[PDB]
């Protein structure tokens, strides 16, 4: 089965379903600040 392992820098965008705008944009380089 395919595995998704977010264990290196990644991006994350919080998007609504209808009105395409972007609520929160983020990139995680290190989980501990």
């Amino acid at each position: 089965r395919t595995i998704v392992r977010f264990n290196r820098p990644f991006l994350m965008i919080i998007v609504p379903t209808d009105t395409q705008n972007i609520f929160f944009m983020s990139k995680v380089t290190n989980p501990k600040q």
């Binding site: 595995i3 998704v4 994350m12 972007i22 380089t29 290190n30």
Partner: protein
């Protein structure tokens, strides 16, 4: 739209300004606050602002623009029993500075604002009030937006967004574990990694830009798009963050059963002073003496001091929350 366009424009700058740091901000909160600003802007001041927000001033009329955000604020503010989400606009105007009826009207009508009488002479207390209105609206997540407050201050426009929604397939606390997170190929650290098994979620392995896109929904009309760029493919990926890429990604996601998924539990909070970035996007006149904000008082006696922005994101087993707020400190000219 222009919005997701403006959004990616700002992101890339925030990156150049600090390459390897975590980034977190709310585009919509910034667009609505600057757009709000437009109501007073005239002539060139206004032109610059609209274009900076990636709006096409020939296809979309000024009036078209404000009518939109109105409708958005309306719908956005639909915090019903399922997920929390609200946005608000306000302006603390110096106690004795009259503003044209039109401005005070369109602000309440189109952006839902208020005009609170503020004695900026008491910067200690003025800052207090404003900080408490944001803390209030964000349910106490954004503390101390206004770090400093000028004495010659005439008014401050502020916006804020609160969002709270649980996942739709929660992570079970029993499954969180200390594991390696690679800061780089030969550099790693231990962090709490959340899990999920035999999961059916939208998926897309983007071979072109070399990254895997995945989607996890919150209860209600909202979701989180995660993009895990390949090892050493982040630079490439960030370069292609174009409004066209996002639509292609969204349009390519198809349902797939994933054996096991791993996501780091984390919380990040960053704040900025957007002056420089906004000036690179083309919003320049509003910062000088040449600034025309005659829509506020009739007289051209105001100018932008600085625009700051704070944001917070908490990613936990129960989804959790995110909030951000923005303020435009206007001074006399």
């Amino acid at each position: 739209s222009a919005n997701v366009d403006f959004a990616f424009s700002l992101y890339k700058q925030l990156v150049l300004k600090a390459p390897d740091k975590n980034v977190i901000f709310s585009p919509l909160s910034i667009s609505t606050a600057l757009a709000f600003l437009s109501l007073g802007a005239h002539n060139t001041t206004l032109t610059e602002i609209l274009k900076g927000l990636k709006f096409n001033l020939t296809e979309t009329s000024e009036a078209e623009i404000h009518q939109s955000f109105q409708h958005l604020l309306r719908t956005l503010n639909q915090s019903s029993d399922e997920l929390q989400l609200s946005m608000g606009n306000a302006m603390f105007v110096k106690e004795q500075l009259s503003l044209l009826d039109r401005f005070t009207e369109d602000a309440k009508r189109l952006y839902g604002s208020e005009a609170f009488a503020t004695d900026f002479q008491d910067s200690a207390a003025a800052k207090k009030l404003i900080n408490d209105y944001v803390k209030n609206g964000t349910r106490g997540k954004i503390t101390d937006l206004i770090k400093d407050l000028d004495s010659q201050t005439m008014m401050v426009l502020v916006n804020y967004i609160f969002f709270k929604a649980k996942w739709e397939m929660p992570f079970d606390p029993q499954d969180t574990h200390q594991s390696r997170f690679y800061l780089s190929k030969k550099k790693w650290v231990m962090v709490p990694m959340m899990s999920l098994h035999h999961l059916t979620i939208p998926y897309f392995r983007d071979e072109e830009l070399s990254c895997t896109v995945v989607e996890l929904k919150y209860t209600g009309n909202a979701s989180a798009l995660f993009i895990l760029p390949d090892q050493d493919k982040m630079e490439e990926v960030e370069a292609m963050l174009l409004p066209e890429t996002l639509k292609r990604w969204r349009d390519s996601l198809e349902f797939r059963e994933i054996g096991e998924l791993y996501l780091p539990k984390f919380s990040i909070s960053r704040d900025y002073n957007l002056n420089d970035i906004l000036l690179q996007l083309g919003i320049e006149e509003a910062f000088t003496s040449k600034a025309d904000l005659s829509g506020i008082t009739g007289a051209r006696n105001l100018a932008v001091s600085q625009v700051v922005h704070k944001a917070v994101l908490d990613v936990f087993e129960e989804g959790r929350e995110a909030s951000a707020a923005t303020a435009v400190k206007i001074t006399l000219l």
